[PDB]
Design a protein around this ligand. Structure first.
Ligand code: HEM
Length: 197
């Protein structure tokens, strides 16, 4: 139950994802990051109670009923990430809201919410962060930077402008989410087993 214990689990799961991700991602630095992030999310979703095997089958209204569990998952993601990386040592509650938006966007897209509407729902989810905070958290995601490297020189991204960035890079972000989905599911299943021992 301790965060250190969840981090050790996520680190072990990341080691099982990494060789397979390397078979298909030629940037090995990006492969290392993907394997840690997908492992951390798999653990966080499992211990937050997001039913990911049901999400991939769910309707949009069923995904929206689960919205508070995604926010809990984001807080656990950011706490684990502090142990494994150190870097997210700051306002944890703000970082948690940002990362929460990631899996919740993907959950709405998986459920069949049209990409542009899902993007607006993300804009809604980020309200309360300053455009400067939004810019700084977006710059910490290697998938967003890989799809939209102009993030690297934005000082200010409003929630609406963040949704516009997702839409402008829809095809690239769909390809990264499709790459990550099988590894997220594998990590979630391994987490559920390891947590339940
Ligand atoms: C579309 C596919 C996405 C993939 C494959 C992905 C992958 C990742 C990975 C691997 C990390 C951790 C990096 C590391 O450990 O070095 C990460 C971090 C992050 N991602 Fe993304 N992400 C995606 C979409 C998004 C979206 C839509 C958001 C919207 C807010 C988002 C927000 C973040 C944030 C804030 C972090 C920082 C984590 C922290 O500081 O604790 N991601 N992402």
């Amino acid at each position: 139950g301790s965060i250190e214990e969840l981090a050790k689990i996520a680190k072990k799961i990341a080691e099982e994802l990494y060789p397979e991700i390397l078979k298909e991602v030629g940037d090995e630095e990006f492969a290392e990051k993907l394997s840690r992030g997908l492992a951390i999310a798999g653990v966080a979703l499992a211990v937050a109670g997001v039913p990911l095997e049901e999400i991939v089958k769910a309707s949009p209204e069923q995904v929206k009923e689960l919205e508070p569990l995604f926010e809990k998952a984001g807080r656990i993601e950011a706490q684990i990430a502090q142990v494994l990386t150190g870097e997210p040592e700051e306002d944890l509650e703000k970082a948690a809201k940002a990362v929460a938006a990631g899996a919740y966007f993907g959950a709405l897209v998986i459920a069949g919410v049209p990409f542009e509407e899902a993007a607006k729902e993300v804009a809604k989810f980020l309200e309360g962060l300053t455009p400067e905070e939004i810019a700084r958290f977006a710059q910490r995601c290697p998938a967003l930077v890989k799809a939209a490297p102009e993030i690297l020189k934005r000082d200010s991204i409003t929630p609406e402008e963040f949704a516009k960035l997702l839409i402008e890079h829809k095809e690239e972000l769909l390809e990264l989410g499709r790459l990550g989905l099988p590894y997220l599911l594998k990590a979630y299943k391994m987490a559920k087993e390891l947590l339940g021992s």
